[PDB]
Design a protein around this ligand. Structure first.
Ligand SMILES: Cc1cc2nc3c(=O)[nH]c(=O)nc-3n(C[C@H](O)[C@H](O)[C@H](O)COP(=O)(O)OP(=O)(O)OC[C@H]3O[C@@H](n4cnc5c(N)ncnc54)[C@H](O)[C@@H]3O)c2cc1C
Ligand SMILES: Cc1cc2nc3c(=O)[nH]c(=O)nc-3n(C[C@H](O)[C@H](O)[C@H](O)COP(=O)(O)OP(=O)(O)OC[C@H]3O[C@@H](n4cnc5c(N)ncnc54)[C@H](O)[C@@H]3O)c2cc1C
Ligand SMILES: Cc1cc2nc3c(=O)[nH]c(=O)nc-3n(C[C@H](O)[C@H](O)[C@H](O)COP(=O)(O)OP(=O)(O)OC[C@H]3O[C@@H](n4cnc5c(N)ncnc54)[C@H](O)[C@@H]3O)c2cc1C
Ligand SMILES: CC1=C(CCOP(=O)(O)OP(=O)(O)O)S/C(=C(\C)O)N1Cc1cnc(C)nc1N
Ligand SMILES: CC1=C(CCOP(=O)(O)OP(=O)(O)O)S/C(=C(\C)O)N1Cc1cnc(C)nc1N
Ligand SMILES: CC1=C(CCOP(=O)(O)OP(=O)(O)O)S/C(=C(\C)O)N1Cc1cnc(C)nc1N
Ligand SMILES: [Mg+2]
Ligand SMILES: [Mg+2]
Ligand SMILES: [Mg+2]
Ligand code: NA
Lengths: 585, 585, 585
């Protein structure tokens, strides 16, 4: 006949299939805590050590599964701790529900302890942002929040005065709209636009297909189009893995978290098919300045012609359209453009292998990532933090459609390593999970290594200890007139941190130590989390956006300096392979 | 003839006497980094491990010295990390300048990497919140920011597109207005209002003077008024120390971070002189429901009659007015009210001493704070985190006008322990500095123990490890119907954390271990930071807001249960002492 | 080689097909004015007398044509005047671009004249809200604004520092993405879902189809489904006219801007097909409290199960879905439910006709609307203000698919009549256009009658002068315990107002005056605007939400007072017709 409004709120979450949620309790949220406590069997509460880890893990939930992630923070500081995760969810356009504690309605606007107007705090990050003021409608407001987060692919925030969830409401009034939820049936891709787009791509002398995660369902089609038409593939960094890295005509990604062949080919291309792609460096890097025809496939009207003057922009699903293209084309013989690219990729990969294959001496990030590769199961999930690791993992990880990898793509918040791995292991307890993090990022969220221990989540944590914000140091080397500042700092021994949180750990600093430590980590991680602290050199990884290899473009002095610094003696510029197969620049 | 706008910005900071500032660099703030790098001799940059520690330490700077604290974060996640500190500065009404990184003006609004409209993020927390759009006026905007932060006692935020500080500006145009800065000369307190207020206080049969930090300059006058007029003193928690704790008629503070005698006396008082006080529990706890006359002294017109219907509210400086009162009164003989209170205080203090004086057995927070007292120099500064520690430190620390103590008073953000101690040691390198923190709060900012090590800041860190959010667990015991949730968690060994950051540390769990460990900590801290991890029991400290000691108010069953739980067999209720000296309730 | 940024911005607007835009110049927007001036042959600036009218006209443009409306206001007060129109655009979810003047980037943040941070002002209303900081990127930011406003169906606001449009940019870099524009994809109905929905609809004893403007393209399908299946139709008020009003099974709308048969039928329905409908009164009025099954069709996932729990929800285009239902059903025989409703409608229409058909005496709103009907062309466009006129127009206008009517549906801002008619006549110079408005609403925007004069826009303005806010007076009558306040005021003669702006006008107060005044107006408006000021009685229109006609529910005394007040002696309650055909209430 009556139900507590809090109990009904948890039933709304359960109706929508929310399996787990994150936060830290407080007085301002103890009535939501009270409802969660009665429902331990149906919904799994994860107590984190800092509320940003809960928000980040909620975002990672949605990134991995497509289902709304859920977090909460108490009034004031609990809620404002959420911000780095909430902005990550906004920028990465994934559905997240955030519940914020608030003092009871009798105490609001009284200027009492930790009481403030919380609504303005969340106005910018949130697609939906409301303070609940009635217990009876509270389940509806939560339901509304979830449904809007899904529809708009962003953050819904509800501030909840603590009195409301302890109030009785009629047991029969409230409902969830989970049962109405569905995905649309779209028409077939516009037939005549697709045909026209196909002709333009096929008429190109130096075509590229450049996809992002919008093409995540189209791995098979992308690779078959490439093979059939002899058109090299490049992607955004996040789209690594959609097509297996081993594919010989995968060029990699452009800009900085980038691979040499992709940057080089992009500069030469006359036609780009830009699919499911919102590459944020398009305009600022002038990526398409020499492109003749720009073709686009996107599902979002807001993206149409956004990144470059577009000759044909098809509004449609990536996979459906690429399938439609493939159904109207057939085999083309190998071209000079194709052979030059394949050769360029081969050369690039032998370079990366030479870095990986060093057997002895001072540990670099390159051999550490080889060691990850050697213990990695074919369906492992990588939660990647922010810094050099994005660049190194992009180059070195050997990913297939079976893998997943996540980072903070566009907000680029450091600290995501640990929470992303926690979310990954909670959703996929049977899959191997890595957290690959630099020392600066790992230290931002280090306390939540304890959360992995507490909830028995067998993450393999690999910390890359360079004693630097390496990513930023390299930027300062490029732009700053004065000395390095704030980018070299004191060592933290993360194997001791892990010990302090009661996690098994190792610290290595020599290449020859890798195989036995990674073997042990692999085994330990059948049951318990583990951390390897890899003490690495401060060597700058090859800057793909600053290549000095082409005689027509750079001085011999610049080239020899570059080859020396980046162990790049055997790298050839693309022009070498173009000229080899009869092409100019 | 020309100067870099960034170089001029640093000269503005130097003009205002900014000694040190906190942050983490990024590409979006590397031009401000570049200017800081040339000015290492005049301004000291502190690289923190998480930007919330920089914001919190900036707030603590202003709390301790009265001078603007300065922090920065890079675009996106660097800036949003600042939030817990910035809200602490807003709520604690201290001047803070926060600089936020932003992409260059050529890239703004392009939807590029980590680029967003940052202005809405800071609208709620900031008294002043602007995006700079011109290099030439940039020093003025920073100057304006600082001057408004001081004038309005809050947070000024400036978002800085990274291109601007690398632009040349005329060397002679920019200026700082530091030279104009002054404090007002106020008239004398309103003579006739003060006289009238004095008569009402003196006519009271059960008077109290109840001061907050607004009376920080009036320690001498407060204590002499009390002694002369025979009027017991109570304060807000933050106002502990203004009058020495040893003063026999100091009652303590009310509510929860509270002391028994203050709560009891407040309930009996017929007249309260409320001075420099903005107690946030006034209305919600109905603190003054039985008060006959409410008198107020405050410097802020916004506070006048804010917390209770006020009979006389003098707009004036606390110290000046209390001095003016003292100059028109003379000795009154001891009264029953005064003797009852003195007796009540004595009884209370013998209780606290009995907890402190245990010599052997399971370690409690009480003996740990005694151990702090025994190594504490008379002018030590305490940076206190948030939770049971506020309640325990308030009761146990033996403070005089020579000490300072700071916490997050009203925003009550956990994590402030470490940054507050960092700020304290940077401002006062010759004073002993403690960080007193619970395990939940210490773990939120644990990474910045490394900042103490890096900058050789000899903080004595004392972590109270109960494996609980004890403050919240006790709240759940009081309000929640269902089981404890999110309040008991896994151990973190902070002596291992400290080892991992290369700090000397100890872990203790027995009362008998205290003296030698604290002696070692004291010595180590002559040159280097140190941490003591105190493993304590989960005993609930006596709830001063839930006393069960008075036969007229509670059942004998409730009283015996209370005495048992809180080792309170020898505590008597105030009514016992009132009746002893001839008074009723 | 170069172009002025402001020139490039106007070219973007031209590429997007903007014909006209509204606003008022100022110094802070004179460089955009300058660009507009050079371009007066290709894009048409409409100078209004108040910026709210320009914003409301822009919203109405988009409401009428689906093409983005464009307005602007100068720095400070110019832009804040836009708000009521911008909020109308947000709530009615139509694309609007608002350009806001701002001081030059050299004077921004200097606290100069009318200079402020303008960005927080627009954060709440706007889908996209940015301050431009670079001239080269300005055309892009404008293009970005328009694309987003279209895609997200809402307001894009750009604050433009005045220096930027006077700066030269490379002539060959900027582009518009207008060429790439597409409308969102129309999802298809699941076949099995539609079959399940149809069978639930056919099994109903008391079915209703209840459509909103989401079904504006499915009038034919709605009417054929009603005829074929013998299922009565009802709509939201904005959906009036999608099916011709003369259709004998059209019940009208529910709640207050409502018709008696729709409210009565809805109360009795067992099954509702809710199509392209977001009726904001669903929950608060408990519209569906006795509905057994609720079937929903909507294109927006955010609406599915929002207003009631669904038994079947179809995420698809309304017309595609309704066409699919119609294709799987055949002719059904009449039912008692069908007949009772047909009879209820006949009774209701005879009541409205009796009101309209009065030939002499004190003028009421009803005969004024009859006079509108008599001069109205089959494809007239009605811009309607806010108040009694929504209720009266809803009952009396005889609309068909060939008409359009607009008001401020959801924000419900008064004053929209005048600007909506301005926009109407600009978009459809060969269609007859009415502005129907109460005296309160006409007053708010009365100065822009001068705008119709200035641009020679032949609107037929009809003001309903009751010297009251009648809508609000009636509410006070219903809820307030004390006397009317603020709801009856002094007369304004709008024929004199019209004379003052140099518009031909009449003032009438008797029923017998209408035919000749309206014939004159009809003729005048072949070439120029005209105004009819109709002095009407203070009669309350029949409250369809407070029917007192059924003696099983109301006292005989309440029924007679209701019949007498509303001239409803011949109205019968639905239960009369349900009983005639053998059904209970
Ligand atoms: C430190 C760091 C540095 C980085 N630098 C780089 C870098 O140098 N190089 C790089 O490549 N990346 C880099 N990034 C990642 C980068 O910022 C962007 O997030 C990324 O390039 C955008 O990738 P995307 O287009 O695949 O994803 P999104 O921006 O999510 O875009 C997805 C697109 O596909 C569309 N879409 C979605 N579903 C469909 C569908 N079914 N059909 C068709 N279209 C669909 C969407 O509308 C959208 O346009 C970096 C990240 C980090 C953390
Ligand atoms: C976990 C936690 C729990 C807490 N709970 C309690 C509790 O139970 N009990 C408790 O006492 N505190 C508690 N607090 C602290 C509490 O929230 C408030 O911050 C505190 O009570 C307010 O103290 P105040 O009035 O001294 O300071 P403020 O709020 O800063 O007020 C200062 C006042 O003095 C005025 N003023 C400033 N200068 C002058 C001057 N020169 N002359 C005259 N007036 C001046 C100001 O205008 C203002 O009114 C808690 C803190 C924490 C972290
Ligand atoms: C003074 C005043 C009083 C009012 N009171 C009343 C009242 O008493 N009664 C009343 O009815 N109205 C009233 N309103 C109007 C009211 O506030 C709402 O705007 C209206 O009822 C909602 O109508 P709607 O659902 O047609 O419009 P919207 O709220 O615009 O909803 C349209 C729906 O259709 C969906 N849709 C859009 N396109 C498609 C498609 N192709 N296929 C399927 N679905 C689609 C959308 O997702 C949306 O859910 C009043 C207005 C005024 C000015
Ligand atoms: C400091 C920093 C970075 C350095 C990361 O240092 P790490 O030690 O984690 O990584 P490595 O490069 O040394 O291997 S990257 C970065 C970007 C990409 O914006 N920032 C700026 C930044 C600063 N602060 C936060 C919370 N997030 C950020 N992204
Ligand atoms: C979790 C918590 C608290 C528990 C602190 O746990 P601790 O372990 O630090 O302290 P103890 O009580 O166990 O000795 S106190 C609190 C208040 C006063 O609001 N909150 C809510 C809270 C939650 N999150 C943040 C960042 N700040 C907060 N103040
Ligand atoms: C005063 C008023 C109304 C009265 C309208 O007075 P009118 O004189 O225009 O209409 P009438 O009813 O007398 O024919 S309706 C209303 C609604 C529906 O919200 N409001 C409140 C209102 C008040 N102010 C504005 C700008 N918009 C509003 N909608
Ligand atoms: Mg590093
Ligand atoms: Mg604790
Ligand atoms: Mg009126
Ligand atoms: Na942390």
């Amino acid at each position: 006949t009556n139900i507590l409004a809090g109990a009904a709120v948890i039933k709304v979450l359960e109706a929508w299939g929310v399996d787990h949620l994150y936060g830290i309790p407080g007085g301002s949220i103890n009535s939501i805590m009270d409802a969660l406590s009665a429902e331990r069997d149906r919904i799994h509460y994860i107590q984190v050590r800092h509320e940003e880890v809960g928000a980040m893990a909620a975002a990672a939930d949605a990134k991995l599964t497509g289902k709304i992630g859920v977090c909460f923070g108490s009034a004031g500081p609990g809620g404002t701790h959420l911000m780095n995760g909430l902005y990550d969810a906004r920028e990465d356009h994934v559905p997240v529900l955030a519940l914020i504690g608030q003092f009871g309605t009798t105490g609001m606007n009284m200027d009492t302890f930790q009481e403030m107007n919380e609504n303005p705090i969340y106005a910018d990050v949130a697609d939906y942002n409301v303070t609940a003021v009635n217990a009876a409608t509270l389940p509806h407001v939560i339901d509304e929040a979830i449904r809007r987060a899904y529809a708009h692919q962003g953050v819904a925030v509800v501030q909840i005065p603590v009195d409301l969830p302890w109030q009785q409401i009629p047991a029969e009034d409230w409902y969830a709209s989970a049962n109405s939820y569905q995905t649309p049936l779209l028409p077939e891709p516009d037939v005549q636009a697709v045909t026209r787009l196909t002709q333009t791509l096929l008429a190109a002398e130096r075509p590229l297909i450049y996809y992002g995660i919008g093409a995540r369902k189209a791995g098979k089609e992308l690779e078959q189009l490439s093979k059939t038409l002899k058109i090299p593939l490049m992607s955004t960094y996040p789209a690594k893995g959609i097509v297996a890295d081993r594919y010989p005509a995968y060029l990699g990604s452009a800009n900085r978290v980038a691979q040499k062949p992709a940057n080089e080919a992009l500069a030469q291309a006359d036609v780009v098919l830009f699919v499911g792609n919102n590459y944020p460096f398009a305009e600022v890097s002038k990526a398409f300045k020499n492109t003749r025809y720009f073709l686009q496939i996107d599902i979002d009207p807001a993206k149409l012609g956004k990144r470059h003057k577009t000759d044909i922009a098809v509004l449609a699903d990536a996979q459906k359209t690429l399938a439609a293209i493939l159904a109207q084309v057939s085999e083309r013989e190998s071209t000079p453009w194709w052979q030059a690219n394949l050769a360029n990729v081969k050369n690039w990969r032998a370079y990366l292998a030479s870095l990986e294959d060093k057997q002895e001496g001072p540990l670099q990030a390159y051999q550490v990532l080889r060691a990850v590769n050697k213990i990695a199961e074919p369906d492992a999930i990588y939660s990647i933090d922010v810094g050099d690791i994005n660049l190194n993992a992009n180059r070195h990880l050997k990913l297939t459609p079976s893998n997943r990898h996540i980072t903070s793509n566009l907000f680029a918040t450091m600290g995501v390593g640990i929470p992303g791995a926690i979310a990954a292991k909670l959703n996929y307890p049977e899959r191997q999970v890595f957290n690959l993090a630099g020392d600066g990022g790992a230290s931002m969220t280090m306390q939540d290594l304890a959360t992995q221990v507490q909830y028995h989540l067998p993450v393999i944590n690999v910390v890359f200890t360079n004693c630097q914000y390496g990513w930023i140091k390299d930027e300062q080397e490029d732009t700053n007139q004065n000395d390095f500042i704030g980018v070299e700092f004191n060592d933290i021994d993360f194997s001791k941190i892990a010990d302090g949180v009661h996690m098994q750990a190792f610290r290595v600093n020599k290449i020859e130590q890798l195989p036995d430590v990674f073997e042990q980590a692999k085994a330990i991680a059948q049951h318990e989390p583990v951390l390897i602290d890899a003490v690495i050199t401060g060597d700058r990884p090859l800057p793909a956006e600053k290549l000095r290899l082409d005689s027509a473009m750079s001085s011999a002095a610049d080239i020899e300096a570059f080859k020396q610094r980046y162990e790049a003696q055997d790298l050839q510029p693309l022009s070498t392979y173009l000229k080899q197969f009869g092409l100019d620049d």
